[PDB]
Amino acid sequence: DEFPIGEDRDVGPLHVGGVYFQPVEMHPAPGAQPSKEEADCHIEADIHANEAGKDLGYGVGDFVPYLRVVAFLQKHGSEKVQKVMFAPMNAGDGPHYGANVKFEEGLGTYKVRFEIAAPSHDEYSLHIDEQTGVSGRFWSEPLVAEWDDFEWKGPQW
Amino acid sequence: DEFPIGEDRDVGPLHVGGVYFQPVEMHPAPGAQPSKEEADCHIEADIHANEAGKDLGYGVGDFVPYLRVVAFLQKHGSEKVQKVMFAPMNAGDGPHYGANVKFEEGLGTYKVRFEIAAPSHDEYSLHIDEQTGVSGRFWSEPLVAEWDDFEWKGPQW
Ligand SMILES: [Co+2]
Ligand SMILES: [Co+2]
Ligand SMILES: [Co+2]
Ligand SMILES: [Co+2]
Ligand SMILES: [Co+2]
Ligand SMILES: [Co+2]
Ligand SMILES: [Co+2]
Numbered sequence: 572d573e574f575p576i577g578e579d580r581d582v583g584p585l586h587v588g589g590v591y592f593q594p595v596e597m598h599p600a601p602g603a604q605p606s607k608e609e610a611d612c613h614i615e616a617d618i619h620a621n622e623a624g625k626d627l628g629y630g631v632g633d634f635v636p637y638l639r640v641v642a643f644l645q646k647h648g649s650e651k652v653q654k655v656m657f658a659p660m661n662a663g664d665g666p667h668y669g670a671n672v673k674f675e676e677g678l679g680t681y682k683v684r685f686e687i688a689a690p691s692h693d694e695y696s697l698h699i700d701e702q703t704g705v706s707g708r709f710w711s712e713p714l715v716a717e718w719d720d721f722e723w724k725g726p727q728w
Numbered sequence: 729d730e731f732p733i734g735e736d737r738d739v740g741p742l743h744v745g746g747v748y749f750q751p752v753e754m755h756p757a758p759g760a761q762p763s764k765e766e767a768d769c770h771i772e773a774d775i776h777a778n779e780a781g782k783d784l785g786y787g788v789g790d791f792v793p794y795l796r797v798v799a800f801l802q803k804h805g806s807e808k809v810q811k812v813m814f815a816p817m818n819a820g821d822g823p824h825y826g827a828n829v830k831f832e833e834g835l836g837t838y839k840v841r842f843e844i845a846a847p848s849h850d851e852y853s854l855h856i857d858e859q860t861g862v863s864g865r866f867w868s869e870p871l872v873a874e875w876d877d878f879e880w881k882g883p884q885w
Contacts, residue, residue, distance in 0.1 A: 593859065595859070595861065596857040596861065597854065597855060597856065598853060598854055598856045599849050599850070599853055601853050613860075628819055628821070628822055628823070629822060629823070630822055633791070633822065633823070634793075636793035636794065636823065637793065637816065658852075658853060659793075659851070659853075660852060660853035660854060660855060661784060661853075661855065661862060662855040662861060662862070663785055663860055665787050666786070666793065694816070695815075695816055695817060695818075696754040696756055696757070696758045696816075697818050697819075698752045698753070698754055698818065698819035698820070699752075699754065699755045700752045700753040702750065703750075703752050703770075703820060704752065704753070704819060704820065705818060
């Protein structure tokens with residue numbers, strides 16, 4: 572089972588969903604994420620183009636690759652913030668941005684914020700000529716999708 | 729308007745098409761590719777998952793991101809080979825890999841080869857747990873789509 576972090580958000584050209592479920596094993600194991608055994612769960616950000624995404628050239632529903640996605644978790648009652656760097660990966664059901672996560676502050680209700688940066692100038696381009704190009708341009712400040720009352724009560728699996 | 733490089737190829741889990749048309753302006757201008765004015769044409773590699781791609785977790789027909797695509801162009805009867813690193817980008821028709829290029833030995837018949845490497849070790853992962861993961865793996869030797877008799881007969885525009 573997948574469990575929602577909250578209701579899907581539309582922000583700019585992106586439709587953004589968040590879900591969590593059991594920790595997974597990834598190859599290669601990304602960055603500094605906890606192993607399947609060490610982690611509390613896996614959290615994924617599903618990011619697909621919405622209608623406004625067409626101005627950048629995307630088809631509506633297309634996965635949007637080359638983004639840099641980071642999550643920030645803050646337990647209600649705490650001033651501590653945990654930063655989670657998501658990584659691009661495929662599961663059985665396709666390309667996602669995801670991470671194994673261990674909640675440093677434990678059980679409780681959290682504010683969960685996804686900050687989504689556009690592809691680096693070095694890593695992606697847009698056709699901009701009249702004939703073949705697109706009208707839109709990538710966003711400069713990261714797009715934000717946030718849920719304010721995410722309840723972490725331990726594994727639901 | 730797009731012109732064909734040759735017949736579409738299926739290689740491993742990828743369906744690969746090659747087209748060319750007038751040089752384009754890109755933002756930012758990628759790597760060391762020629763400008764719109766300096767180039768002879770823009771060449772695109774259109775790469776989507778085929779049925780064998782479903783084992784890697786891709787939706788069949790999905791664009792396959794994070795690949796490293798390099799084109800080699802060699803005029804018939806010549807020992808000179810041009811190496812062109814393609815860049816990921818969007819045009820009005822969506823994400824693809826491509827480049828502005830010059831045909832450096834002028835008009836005539838060229839061998840055109842796309843070598844397609846899987847994502848860098850640190851750029852992508854697969855879920856591999858039995859529960860959420862996939863049973864396929866990335867290819868180790870780059871995949872090759874090639875056309876032995878592409879005719880560069882100059883701008884068709
Ligand atoms: Co939705
Ligand atoms: Co939407
Ligand atoms: Co999903
Ligand atoms: Co994942
Ligand atoms: Co820019
Ligand atoms: Co292009
Ligand atoms: Co590997």
